[PDB]
Amino acid sequence: MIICSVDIGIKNPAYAIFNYDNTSNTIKLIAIEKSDWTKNWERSVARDLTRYNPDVVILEKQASPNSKIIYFIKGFFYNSNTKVIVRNPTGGSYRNRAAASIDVFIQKISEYTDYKNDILNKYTKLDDIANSFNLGLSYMESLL
Amino acid sequence: MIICSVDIGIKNPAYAIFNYDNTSNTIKLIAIEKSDWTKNWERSVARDLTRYNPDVVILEKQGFASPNSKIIYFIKGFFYNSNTKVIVRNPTGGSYRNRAAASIDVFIQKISEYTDYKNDILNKYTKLDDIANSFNLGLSYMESL
């Protein structure tokens, strides 16, 4: 089973891709990447989602130009075999949320990837990365 | 060529289906029906759009603050990379009731040129707002053709 969580944005989208092994009840992080959806966001989203052929897609619940992406994905995976689930954002002011997410990320990712240093060196801004990672985790917590 | 114009609404959706013959430069109305998208709007929209297998789909432009852009972009994703083109068109002044009145007048007087089935269309559907809207939207698209 392949899981695709997506922090949705135009200038700063991000996606985390997990592999779910129901046999071993374990979870392995495959890849988190920062994307760009400013030039033909439709084709960019289709590409980025179908790249790894996911079994389930997790979208962050958000008048914003991102609900169009939510429903574009919903229509794009409707007649397919991929389930699209929209989840709530994974307290305080809205500005504190990104800091809490980055802390939880930098402290929780080491259990899943073993590739922490290169992820931190490649991507300096950890907002959307942390958001997608925590969104995927919050979905999979309901599974186990 | 089959053209599908869609007046978008949850409790009051409507769709007009035209047949476009580029050879004869003529246009024939096939069917206009009022739909219901209150129970699983996703399945309802997929059903109503794939019903006649259209070559092009015409969608009404809606603001992001309206609960209908979700239907717009659901359709866009639903027909993406397919052989059906999805085009969003502008609404075909004053109050919404004056807009609907002008649309109903243009509809009730212009449909007879295309369907020959005016009397039964008027007898079946009493409220003509969204029906007229979808018909005029399809016409406004084909005028560009």
Strand duo B56-60 + B2-7: pairing: parallel
> Which of A42, A71, A73, A74 to mutate to probe the B interface, most B CBs <10 Å?
A71
Taken in order B5, B89, A42, A18, the sign of the CA dihedral is negative
Distance CA B88, CA A128 (A): 31
Q: In chain A, which residue's Cα lies nearest the Cα of B74?
A: A75
Nearest by CB: A42 against B70, B72, B80: B80
Number of domains in chain B: 1
Cβ count near B68 (within 10 Å): 18
CA-based nearest distance A63→chain B, Å:
5
Is there a contact between A97 and A130 (Cβ–Cβ < 8 Å)?
no
Is there a contact between B12 and B125 (Cβ–Cβ < 8 Å)?
no
Distance CA A100, CA A105 (A): 8
Q: Which domain holds residue A37?
A: 1-144
All residues of chain A having their beta carbon less than 8 Å from the beta carbon of residue B64 are: 63-65, 67-68
The distance from CA A89 to its chain's CA centroid, rounded to whole angstroms, is: 11
